[PDB]
Write a protein that binds this ligand. Structure first.
Ligand SMILES: Nc1nc2c(ncn2[C@@H]2O[C@H](COP(=O)(O)OP(=O)(O)OP(=O)(O)O)[C@@H](O)[C@H]2O)c(=O)[nH]1
Ligand SMILES: [Mg+2]
Ligand SMILES: [Mg+2]
Ligand SMILES: [Mg+2]
Ligand SMILES: [Mg+2]
Ligand SMILES: [Mg+2]
Ligand SMILES: [Mg+2]
Ligand SMILES: [Mg+2]
Ligand SMILES: [Mg+2]
Ligand SMILES: [Mg+2]
Ligand SMILES: [Mg+2]
Ligand SMILES: [Mg+2]
Ligand SMILES: [Mg+2]
Ligand SMILES: [Mg+2]
Ligand SMILES: [Mg+2]
Ligand SMILES: [Mg+2]
Ligand SMILES: [Mg+2]
Ligand SMILES: [Mg+2]
Ligand SMILES: [Mg+2]
Lengths: 115, 68, 416
RNA sequence: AUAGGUUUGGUCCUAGCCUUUCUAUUAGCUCUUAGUAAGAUUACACAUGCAAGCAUCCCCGUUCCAGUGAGUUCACCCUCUAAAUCACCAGAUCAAAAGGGACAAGCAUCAAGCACGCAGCAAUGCAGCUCAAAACGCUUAGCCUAGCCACACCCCCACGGGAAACAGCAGUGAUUAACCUUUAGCAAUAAACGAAAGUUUAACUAAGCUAUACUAACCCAGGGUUGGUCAAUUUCGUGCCAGCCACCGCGGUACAC
RNA sequence: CCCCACUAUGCUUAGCCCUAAACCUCAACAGUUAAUCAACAAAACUGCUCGCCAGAACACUACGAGCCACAGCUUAAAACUCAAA
RNA sequence: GAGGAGACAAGUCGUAACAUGGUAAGUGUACUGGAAAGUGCACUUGGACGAACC
């Protein structure tokens, strides 16, 4: 389908079954469907803890670098995954959400102590 | 029925949904298919009748099941 | 295993709660019942039994069932009498007590419903309410004037005179009756009319009698079931609830229930489907017994042996009540000897390709009562030689039917 | 195919038909639970509700997602090179238009098409080009499925006209053997927007209905068949009638009704 | 069917017609007689090529097409039917 | 409307075919006839001529 405009994006395509999410890190044209045609599958991501309490993420770092060079954008979840991986800096929103969680738990603890 | 079989097979002329007029053999011991009644008709030729290449599906629309 | 869903046992005295009254305005043709209803609602032949939830100046709410007065709609009048709990008969003293007036009186007697006489057109000359009451004496409606219980109210629906007294009398009789019903639990009601809207599917205008109806309920009536999809009023505005004695139009009907059928709420869609299957099986057993007797007769005959002027008619109506009325008029045919009348197919809705095909197959005529036939249907009918006859009035359609019968021959059948 | 039944008075050969297997739709009869998957027959007509916003005004998007299969050798390879991304450029990626090649099925009782070619800068000249190795023509079909092509009410297009558009989600009438909710939230991923917190999204997610299927369970089993092919019948009733059969066949006082 | 008479016709000329059990029902070319070969018939095969065939009947048919053919010839289907032929 | 085919299905007139089917059968073609079919010309054996001489 001849798309006007658009641009490559490295993003998560949701596969899996109901109640069982699973993501394929695919470098795809942004206008293309979420789970549709993709230029290249750069990795995978299982968001459910496995028997060892792990969320397995596989990042084809070489091709990810090649596509970032070739001019592909990064969706926010992919940016946060890379930030956790240390391939990127931690996302400003990850940091701010961590601080928000710290403040929220602090309020909860303070109220529990008071009551 | 064609020889050697001998009987009086019950049949009905019906105008199918496709606009065609066909002859459907009515199975079962006894029926009450009167004129203007709506029936469902499936394939399967009655072997002893030449040209009667359909059968009324019992229990559907106005063709009640065979009384025991 | 019997899976039928039956009406719940009569409500407990503690569970009982006051409810509105249900009033049917019966009477013979053109005695101003429609005018009286319009005046009460603050807003030339009736052909539909219409339910309206009116609010009186006192703040009370009353459900009025305006019924047709024509002789043809005896079924409609009987259904209205059965469903209602008060019959505000309307009689024009100038015209006097008539055949349909007496019919309504008998229906009220059967239903065991208090009757209130409203003398209509009392403004006009020659109006003799005393004579009206006298004549009613013969038909057992003993007005309070002649030492009785029936309240007679002189009114002039056109001029709106004494209607306040009529409403006051109705409210007083309602309070005396002390009508109450359980507002909670599975809903119970009766279908007042059923039809097919090209937008809203199969709809049924019913009157609730118990419990409260709400979107998402599962109802069963006759061989039909529904998941209540849209509850609407006379003006179509959606209503979130339908308390007892509330007229409500319910959408979401998988099949078009017969008029007057009982509607009962069941637990779930699978339970409703089980109930419908069981009822269809019961009907199948009954028809099977009939067919078994006929077949046994035929088979005995066969074993012992072994030892034209016909009018085919398709009927299409706007509502099931209208279709039933036309069917009764047809069944009153008695001149089969000179010409036979055959009813190929009856239904509710605009003339359809299936109706046209039946007409073509049986050389029939389509009679559409208050229904349309799109240009596509008209073109197909012209192509196939079918004749469509769209009538908006029952007696006009009956006249046309008689004319066709004579053309086939005048026809000896008198509708009466 | 590991094949079987069937031509005949009988054998052999050829041969069609049917059986056995596996799926899918519909129908009859019947049905307990849980998880998942899939789900109008119709390019016929649509009530109603929603489905595209974002954002310090401009811009950007609403050309995407979603849908249907009417039409149908526009999909794949190469050449060239637009638009878009790479904060600017860089060449890199992506991929249009254009040009070259490849590209469904049947009908030859569709065998001729009738300008379908070339040269010249131009003027103009030559009379050529396709075709029995299937041209031209008719009918049918969405395809080669991480998805792709095509259509977007019809007039191929859409200035213009017909007319007032659900082939977006839910739903409806008609139609067919064929028939899912007129649910909830953007919490996750995707998209749009913004510098951003964030907002929006009938995409999607999580639910609703359906034995259509797979898995698991069930302490309440129905359906079909019982002459042979083909697992499997006791006694009655009927008596070439009623009836039964996928093929061979049965029923004239029955392991076939 | 047997007997008699006689005509078109069989003959010559100039055109048409283009069908046969036109059959040796056995295609052309090259080659072998070795391990045979359903039956019968005129033994069985190998290589290569062209034409043709794919249940029976409808059917040397209808339509379409071509033809000096006008009750014709060539090509030639389908629908219904059967479990055989 | 009429024809053609098929099937169903008992009749009517003959006995054309299967035996040398009582005139051997049939192909093409022509004329003729209720009807199969008859005859004319050529062709085939998918018939025979009894297989030493007599
Ligand atoms: N003079 C007078 N006329 C009245 C009065 N009330 C009603 N009418 C008229 O009397 C007639 C009553 O007929 P409707 O009630 O409309 O109809 P109907 O009784 O169903 O009769 P059908 O529909 O023909 O069966 C109408 O013309 C009214 O307007 C009244 O009080 N006085
Ligand atoms: Mg009235
Ligand atoms: Mg089923
Ligand atoms: Mg198509
Ligand atoms: Mg042809
Ligand atoms: Mg549309
Ligand atoms: Mg268009
Ligand atoms: Mg929709
Ligand atoms: Mg519908
Ligand atoms: Mg289905
Ligand atoms: Mg016996
Ligand atoms: Mg020869
Ligand atoms: Mg010939
Ligand atoms: Mg011919
Ligand atoms: Mg011809
Ligand atoms: Mg003979
Ligand atoms: Mg002979
Ligand atoms: Mg001869
Ligand atoms: Mg002769």
């Amino acid at each position: 389908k001849a798309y006007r405009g658009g641009h490559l994006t490295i993003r998560l395509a949701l596969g899996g079954c109901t109640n069982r999410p699973f993501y394929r890190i695919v470098a795809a044209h942004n206008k293309c469907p979420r789970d549709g045609r993709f230029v290249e599958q750069l990795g995978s991501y299982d968001p459910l803890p496995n028997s060892h309490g792990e969320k397995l993420v596989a990042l084809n770092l070489d091709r990810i670098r090649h596509w970032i060079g070739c001019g592909a954008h990064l969706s926010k979840p992919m940016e946060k995954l890379l930030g956790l991986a240390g391939f990127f800096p931690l996302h400003p929103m990850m940091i701010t959400n961590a601080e928000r969680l710290r403040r929220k738990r602090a309020r909860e603890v303070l109220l529990a102590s008071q009551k | 029925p064609k020889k050697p079989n001998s009987a009086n097979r019950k049949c009905c002329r019906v105008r199918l949904s496709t606009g065609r007029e066909a002859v459907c053999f009515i199975p079962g011991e006894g029926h009450t298919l009167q004129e203007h009644q709506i029936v469902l008709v499936e394939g399967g030729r009655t072997q002893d009748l030449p040209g009667v290449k359909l059968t009324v599906v019992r229990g559907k629309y106005d063709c009640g099941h065979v009384q025991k | 295993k019997n899976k039928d869903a039956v009406r719940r046992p009569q409500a407990d005295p503690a569970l009982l709660t006051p409810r509105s009254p249900v009033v049917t305005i019966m009477g013979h043709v053109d005695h101003g019942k429609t005018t009286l209803l319009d005046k009460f609602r603050k807003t030339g032949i009736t052909q539909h039994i219409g339910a309206f939830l009116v609010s009186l100046p006192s703040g009370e709410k009353i459900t009025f069932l305006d019924t047709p007065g024509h002789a043809a709609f005896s079924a409609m009048r009987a259904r209205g009498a059965q469903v209602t709990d008060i019959v505000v008969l309307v009689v024009a003293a100038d015209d006097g007590v008539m055949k349909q007036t007496v019919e309504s009186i008998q229906h009220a007697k059967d239903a065991q419903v208090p009757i209130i006489l409203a003398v209509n057109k009392c403004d006009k000359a020659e109006a003799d309410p005393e004579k009206v009451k006298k004549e009613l004496l013969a038909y057992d409606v003993v007005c309070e004037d002649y030492g009785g219980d029936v309240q007679a109210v002189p009114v002039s629906a056109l001029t709106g005179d004494n209607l306040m007294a009529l409403a006051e009398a109705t409210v007083a009789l309602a309070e005396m009756l002390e009508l109450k019903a359980d507002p909670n639990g599975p809903v119970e009601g009766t279908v007042i009319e059923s039809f097919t809207d090209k937008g809203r599917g199969l709809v049924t205008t019913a009157i609730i009698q118990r419990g409260t109806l709400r979107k998402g309920s599962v109802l069963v009536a006759g061989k039909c079931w529904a998941k209540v999809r849209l509850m609407f009023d006379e003006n179509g505005k959606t209503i979130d609830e339908a308390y007892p004695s509330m007229p409500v139009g319910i959408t979401g009907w998988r099949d078009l229930p017969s008029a007057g059928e009982e509607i009962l709420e069941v637990e779930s869609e699978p339970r409703a489907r089980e109930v419908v299957d069981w009822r269809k099986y019961e009907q199948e057993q009954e028809k099977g017994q009939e067919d078994l007797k006929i077949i046994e007769e035929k088979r005995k005959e066969h074993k012992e042996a072994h030892q034209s002027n016909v009018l085919s008619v398709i009927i299409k109506g706007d509502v099931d009540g209208s279709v039933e009325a036309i069917l009764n008029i047809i069944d009153t045919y008695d001149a089969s000897h000179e010409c036979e009348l055959e009813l190929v197919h009856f239904g509710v809705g605009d003339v359809s390709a299936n109706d046209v095909n039946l007409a073509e197959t049986f050389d029939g005529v389509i009679y559409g009562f208050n229904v349309n036939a799109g240009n596509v249907i008209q073109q197909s009918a012209a192509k196939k030689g079918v004749k469509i006859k769209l009538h908006k009035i029952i007696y006009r359609l009956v006249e046309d039917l008689q004319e066709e019968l004579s053309s086939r021959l005048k026809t000896s059948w008198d509708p009466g």
